[PDB]
């Protein structure tokens, strides 16, 4: 088409990322803005508020973010990288919406000669005046930096030698690297700061008078400090797994000291929080302290409150955590209500008001890889009734979750609610299928299906939380293919060990037996054998299923090989499935096998593609149901299908006969099969005409068969299968087709106009649009690196010109090639 017409239809943009960012390294939180901050090893900074409020930034040096400090009240933040550099970020409103940008940077450097092991920043303390940064270092010296306009203030430095001179003789036995471990401001006096050193010396320092007001020397090595809200109590934690309480009123002794998980030797308690409540029952949250021999491998955060104590246990390393408190600066009590934990593989939020401390559902930042993703499947425009029933069944399985509204709700989302409901289904290694709301900026878990059901298999107070599982139990359960009929609520899922399940949406629970049917694909091949995966043992007798997608029939391929293709026709109530050996058709109404076809006689018979079509196979006048299969060797099989009417659906059996066998002479694997109607419009989905008679295919004009191989596109006329058009992609451009999907491209110049075209993902990671029906290449975009074999394998298209691919094991990148779609965040955040 003309280039002016291309610009109304096609335009490539990567718009948003969905999921849990790879390898987090720092956590920050602003209690005034109610906004979460996450830094990564790659130098990324990511901010989150209410759903729709999110920002991303990148440090120019791609070094790990180690600390994030959102300035009190202000719309600013200071990050620290592992190269010891500090950076000042801000949220300025440009164009009525907020945006994140880096203002300045600063590397604290000592006089030439001083080792870097001395100027290494340990603690960053933003002063309540919002004008000064106090910087503790491994040498024991506290430096002061002005804000904004980064400038060190050498006259305000608090050195270790200046502190030790104000102290008695027995408190002066310093180490070479005093190592500032704590650096805090008095909660009720901006003139006093606490400095804590590794060897156990803690001082309270009068900034204006340059003198020590208070000090103690703990018996154990110091790890961290917490200053009670009123400033009259200090809690320290130590390298032997103990913590002490200290009064603040000179040179005192501990009020209390204990190793919470003794008497065994314990690992350090590395962070501790002491939080008051109006009810007079304080919270004690601390990280670590595990018995070294039996639990040293554990990633724990313990919570003590009102005689109750739980050691929350996470399956990945704790990167950082925070506790949301009802209190603002003025409040007398802290009153915690949520514990937010950033682990290396997931975010976890705990409700601290509700007894039992239940988890909070995530609206975003979901660990898509809590079981490894093995396939995906996108469905656009969901019927509202089906959508509500999915969401309903999701709530029923999430009853153990807290009812607390999402607390990290800062900012204001400026984007209207999505007009269209999109679903992204993910298949996983453990046999689960998750239903994600892919409509807008936030990818939210709506419902989870577990297919493992149909097959056969206190001190410290550990409680396992989170969802990430690092262990691979049974790879046979892995979901390979997914087909959801958004009209009938039927669902077909296919697995790694030849298992094919057809399921149906149900509002209520059910107790039923899953009917098992074997599909032997080597029936006409004696002497064969199967090396490897034994079939999954199915549950005999009835099984109880919660509300959701409930399986009623299991088709077990023999041999139980990886199911390599799947198609479901919800109107004819048939399911087709392929393996490396052959393919077969199954009547899931009668729960009987219609036919089975082996493909190993002229891998090569490897069935890549399956496609139902009501089109012309023999005569130009009558159009019958049909199934099409494409193989790795360029072969296309077509089967005429006799489907009884509604009344006779259970009385007479469905009949099939091989009507066509087309061979592509270039002999490349068939990746896509499609039929266009008389107006060259692709045939509609099953039950789409039943729900919309305007989509009834044109039977007046001649139908055309589109076959896409890895090397070529080809259009034949039906029923003769006479060649009409072709595009030799690999010959022309040197690229190979990885996958291809039909996509409707609407015009941005005409409100209600659009054309169907082919979205094509190549083995070079490119994304091409090939026109229909003429097979002319329209646009080619760079998207995924050609070396990114996992990202290319994970890429999935939408029906209307969007797409998703995995940039990491745990998050998608959303791209759009259509001018009608641009799902990006737009939000406002102010103080
Ligand atoms: Cl463009």
Q: How far is the CA of 10 from the centre of ligand 1 (A)?
A: 6
* CB proximity list for 378: less than 8 A, separation 6 or greater: 422, 423, 424, 425, 438, 796, 797, 798, 799, 804
CA–CA gap between residue 387 and residue 664 (Å, rounded): 42
Contact criterion met (CB below 8 Å) for 281 and 266: no
Strand partners, 676: 682, 704
CA–CA gap between residue 23 and residue 658 (Å, rounded): 52
Name the burial class of residue 736, with classes exposed (0-12), middle (13-18) and buried (19+) by CB atoms within 10 angstroms of its CB.
middle
Q: How far is the CA of 42 from the centre of ligand 1 (A)?
A: 28
Contact criterion met (CB below 8 Å) for 648 and 624: no
Q: How far is the CA of 7 from the centre of ligand 1 (A)?
A: 8
Q: How far is the CA of 53 from the centre of ligand 1 (A)?
A: 26
Where would I find the H helices in 734-795?
Answer: 789-794
Q: How far is the CA of 391 from the centre of ligand 1 (A)?
A: 36
Q: How far is the CA of 782 from the centre of ligand 1 (A)?
A: 10
CA–CA gap between residue 361 and residue 395 (Å, rounded): 10
Breaks (C-N over 2.5 A) in the chain follow: 249, 457, 602
Quick one: which of 347, 221, 353, 237 has its CA closest to 285?
A: 237
CA–CA gap between residue 825 and residue 222 (Å, rounded): 44
Q: How far is the CA of 679 from the centre of ligand 1 (A)?
A: 28
CA–CA gap between residue 631 and residue 21 (Å, rounded): 38
Contact criterion met (CB below 8 Å) for 739 and 755: no
- DSSP 8-state code for residue 149: T
Quick one: which of 719, 707, 717 has its CA closest to 758?
A: 707
Q: How far is the CA of 791 from the centre of ligand 1 (A)?
A: 21
CA–CA gap between residue 448 and residue 327 (Å, rounded): 36
**Tell me: domain 3-373, CATH 2.130.10.10, correct?**
yes
Tokens of 98: 């907020």
SS (H, E, C) 629-669: EEECCCEEEEEEEECCCCHHHCCCCCEEEEEEEEECCCCCC
Q: How far is the CA of 818 from the centre of ligand 1 (A)?
A: 9
Q: How far is the CA of 13 from the centre of ligand 1 (A)?
A: 7
Q: How far is the CA of 780 from the centre of ligand 1 (A)?
A: 9
Q: How far is the CA of 817 from the centre of ligand 1 (A)?
A: 8
Q: How far is the CA of 790 from the centre of ligand 1 (A)?
A: 25
Contact criterion met (CB below 8 Å) for 147 and 156: no
Size of the chain, expressed as the number of residues it contains: 831
Strand partners, 495: 479
Q: How many CA atoms lie within 13 A of 309 on its CB side?
A: 13
Q: Is 431 left (phi over 0), alpha (psi -120 to 50) or beta?
A: left
Q: How far is the CA of 734 from the centre of ligand 1 (A)?
A: 22
Q: Give the gyration radius of the chain's Cα atoms.
A: 32
Where would I find the H helices in 602-739?
Answer: 688-691, 729-733
Q: How far is the CA of 18 from the centre of ligand 1 (A)?
A: 22
Q: How far is the CA of 22 from the centre of ligand 1 (A)?
A: 28
| Neighbour-count burial for 642-655, b at 16+ CB within 10 Å, e otherwise | ebbeeeeeeeeebe
Q: How far is the CA of 680 from the centre of ligand 1 (A)?
A: 26
Q: How far is the CA of 37 from the centre of ligand 1 (A)?
A: 32
Cis-peptide, bond into residue 542, ω within 30° of zero: no
Q: How far is the CA of 786 from the centre of ligand 1 (A)?
A: 20
Q: How far is the CA of 442 from the centre of ligand 1 (A)?
A: 25
Cis-peptide, bond into residue 773, ω within 30° of zero: yes
Q: Is the dihedral of CA 95, 100, 101, 106 positive or negative?
A: positive
CA–CA gap between residue 543 and residue 178 (Å, rounded): 64
Beta strands at 548-558 and 515-520: parallel, antiparallel or unpaired: parallel
Q: How far is the CA of 769 from the centre of ligand 1 (A)?
A: 12
Q: How far is the CA of 696 from the centre of ligand 1 (A)?
A: 33
Q: How far is the CA of 658 from the centre of ligand 1 (A)?
A: 44
Residue 347 to residues 24, 320, 369, 489, 505, Cα–Cα distance (Å): 10, 10, 12, 32, 30
Q: How far is the CA of 816 from the centre of ligand 1 (A)?
A: 10
Q: How far is the CA of 731 from the centre of ligand 1 (A)?
A: 25
CA–CA gap between residue 364 and residue 18 (Å, rounded): 8
Residue keyed to tokens 């090939």:
770
Residue keyed to tokens 């807008």:
440
Residue 752 to residues 413, 497, 757, 798, Cα–Cα distance (Å): 28, 46, 17, 19
Beta strands at 54-58 and 44-48: parallel, antiparallel or unpaired: antiparallel
- DSSP 8-state code for residue 119: H
Contact criterion met (CB below 8 Å) for 303 and 283: yes
Neighbours of ion ligand 1 (CB under 5 A): 11-12
Q: Is 73 left (phi over 0), alpha (psi -120 to 50) or beta?
A: left
Q: How far is the CA of 815 from the centre of ligand 1 (A)?
A: 12
Q: How far is the CA of 593 from the centre of ligand 1 (A)?
A: 48
Strand order from edge to edge, sheet including 180-186: 180-186, 189-197, 201-206, 211-217
Contact criterion met (CB below 8 Å) for 11 and 798: no
Q: How far is the CA of 158 from the centre of ligand 1 (A)?
A: 56
H or E element that contains 162: helix 160-165
* CB proximity list for 396: less than 8 A, separation 6 or greater: 546, 547, 548
DSSP 206-232: ETTTTEEEEEEE-SS-EEEEEE-TTSS
Residue keyed to tokens 């039906």:
718
Q: How far is the CA of 766 from the centre of ligand 1 (A)?
A: 13
* CB proximity list for 509: less than 8 A, separation 6 or greater: 544, 545, 546, 547
CA 767 to chain centre: 23
Q: How far is the CA of 309 from the centre of ligand 1 (A)?
A: 57
DSSP 248-302: -------SEEE-TT-SS-B--EEEEEEE--TTS--EEEEEE--BHHHHTT-EEEE
CA–CA gap between residue 671 and residue 741 (Å, rounded): 10
Q: How far is the CA of 11 from the centre of ligand 1 (A)?
A: 4
Cis-peptide, bond into residue 263, ω within 30° of zero: yes
H or E element that contains 161: helix 160-165
Q: Is 29 left (phi over 0), alpha (psi -120 to 50) or beta?
A: beta
Contact criterion met (CB below 8 Å) for 184 and 128: no
Quick one: which of 667, 515, 530, 670 has its CA closest to 602?
A: 667
Q: How far is the CA of 810 from the centre of ligand 1 (A)?
A: 28
CA–CA gap between residue 777 and residue 736 (Å, rounded): 14
Q: How far is the CA of 12 from the centre of ligand 1 (A)?
A: 4
830 SS3 class: coil
Q: How far is the CA of 6 from the centre of ligand 1 (A)?
A: 9
Q: How far is the CA of 34 from the centre of ligand 1 (A)?
A: 37
Q: How many CA atoms lie within 13 A of 577 on its CB side?
A: 37
SS (H, E, C) 372-431: CEEEEEEECCCCHHHHHHHHHHHHHHCCCCCCCCCCCCCCEECCCCCCCCCEEEEEECCC
Output phi, psi for 512, to 5 deg. -155, 155
């Amino acid at each position: 088409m003309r280039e002016r017409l291309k610009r109304d239809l096609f335009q490539f943009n990567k718009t948003v990322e969905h999921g849990f960012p790879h390898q987090p390294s720092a956590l920050g939180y602003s209690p005034s803005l109610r906004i979460l901050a996450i830094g990564t090893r790659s130098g990324a900074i990511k901010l989150y508020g209410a759903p729709g409020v999110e920002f991303m930034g990148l440090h120019q040096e791609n070094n790990a973010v180690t600390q994030i400090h959102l300035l009190p009240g202000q719309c600013q933040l200071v990050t620290l990288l592992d190269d010891n550099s500090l950076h000042l970020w801000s949220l300025k409103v440009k164009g009525g919406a907020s945006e994140l940008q880096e203002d300045e940077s600063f590397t604290l450097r000592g006089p030439p000669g001083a080792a870097p092991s001395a100027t290494q920043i340990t603690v960053v303390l933003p002063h309540s005046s919002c004008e000064l940064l106090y910087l503790g270092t491994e040498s024991g010296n506290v430096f002061v930096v002005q804000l904004p306009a980064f400038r060190a203030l050498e006259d305000r430095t608090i050195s270790s030698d200046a502190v030790l001179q104000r102290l008695p003789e027995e408190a002066r036995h310093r180490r070479v690297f005093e190592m500032v471990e704590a650096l805090q401001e008095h909660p009720r006096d901006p003139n006093q700061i606490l400095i804590g050193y590794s060897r156990g010396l803690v001082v309270i320092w009068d900034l204006q008078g340059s003198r020590v007001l208070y000090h103690f020397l703990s018996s154990q090595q110091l790890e961290n400090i917490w200053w009670q809200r009123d400033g009259r109590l200090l809690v320290s934690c130590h390298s032997d797994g103990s913590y002490c309480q200290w009064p603040v009123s000179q040179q005192p002794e501990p009020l209390r000291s204990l190793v919470p998980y003794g008497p065994f030797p314990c690992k350090a308690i590395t962070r501790i929080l002491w939080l008051t409540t109006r009810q007079g029952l304080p919270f004690t949250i601390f990280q670590g302290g595990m018995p070294r021999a039996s639990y040293g491998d554990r990633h724990c955060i313990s919570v003590i409150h009102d005689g109750q104590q739980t050691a929350f246990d996470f399956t990945s390393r704790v990167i950082g955590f925070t506790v949301l408190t009802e209190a603002d600066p003025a409040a007398t009590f802290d009153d915690p209500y949520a514990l937010v934990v950033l682990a290396e593989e997931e975010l976890v939020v705990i409700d601290l008001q509700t007894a039992g401390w239940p988890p909070v559902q995530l609206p975003y930042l979901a660990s898509l890889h809590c079981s490894a993703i093995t396939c995906s499947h996108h469905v656009s425009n969901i019927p509202l009734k089906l959508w509500e029933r999915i969401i309903a069944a999701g709530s029923r399985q999430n009853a153990h979750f807290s009812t607390m509204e999402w607390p990290i709700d800062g900012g204001t989302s400026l984007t209207p609610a999505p007009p269209q409901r999109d679903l992204l289904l993910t298949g996983h290694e453990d046999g689960t299928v998750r239903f994600w709301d892919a409509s807008g900026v936030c990818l939210r878990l709506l419902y989870k299906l577990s297919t493992v059901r149909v097959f056969l298999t206190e001190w410290p107070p550990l409680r396992k939380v989170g969802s990430f599982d690092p262990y691979s139990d049974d790879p046979r359960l892995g979901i390979q293919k997914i087909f959801l009929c958004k009209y009938s609520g039927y669902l077909a899922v296919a697995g790694t060990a030849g298992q094919v399940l057809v399921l149906e949406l149900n509002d209520e629970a059910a107790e039923q037996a899953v009917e098992q049917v074997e599909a032997d694909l080597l029936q006409d091949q004696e002497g064969y054998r199967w090396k490897g995966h034994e079939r999954l043992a199915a549950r005999s007798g009835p099984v109880r299923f919660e509300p959701g997608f409930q399986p009623f029939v299991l088709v077990q391929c023999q041999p139980p090989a990886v199911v390599t293709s799947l198609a479901l026709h919800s109107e004819w109530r048939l399911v087709a499935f392929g393996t490396s050996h052959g393919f077969g058709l199954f009547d899931h109404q009668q729960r009987r096998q219609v036919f089975v076809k082996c493909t190993l006689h002229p891998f090569t018979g490897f069935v890549r593609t399956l496609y139902f079509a009501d089109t012309y196979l023999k005569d130009s006048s009558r159009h019958c149901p049909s199934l099409w299969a494409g193989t790795n060797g360029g072969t296309i099989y077509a089967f005429s299908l006799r489907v009884p009417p509604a009344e006779r659906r259970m009385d007479e059996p469905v009949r099939a006969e091989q009507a066509k066998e087309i061979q592509l002479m270039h002999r490349a694997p068939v990746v896509g099969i499609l039929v266009l109607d008389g107006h060259s419009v692709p045939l509609p989905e099953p039950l789409e005409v039943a729900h919309d008679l305007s989509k009834s295919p044109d039977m007046q004009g001649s139908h055309q068969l589109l076959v896409v191989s890895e090397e070529q596109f080809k259009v034949f006329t039906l029923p003769k299968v006479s060649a009409k058009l072709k595009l030799k992609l690999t010959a022309l451009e040197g690229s190979r087709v990885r996958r291809v999907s039909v996509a409707h491209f609407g015009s941005r110049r005409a409100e209600d106009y659009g054309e169907h075209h082919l979205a094509v993902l190549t083995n070079l990671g490119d994304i091409q649009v090939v026109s229909l029906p003429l097979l002319k290449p329209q646009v080619r975009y760079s998207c995924i690196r050609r070396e990114d074999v996992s990202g290319i394998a994970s890429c999935v298209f939408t029906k209307y010109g969007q797409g998703f691919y995995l940039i990491s094991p745990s998050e998608f990148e959303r791209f759009s090639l259509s001018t009608k779609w641009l799902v990006e965040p737009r939000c406002l955040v102010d103080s």
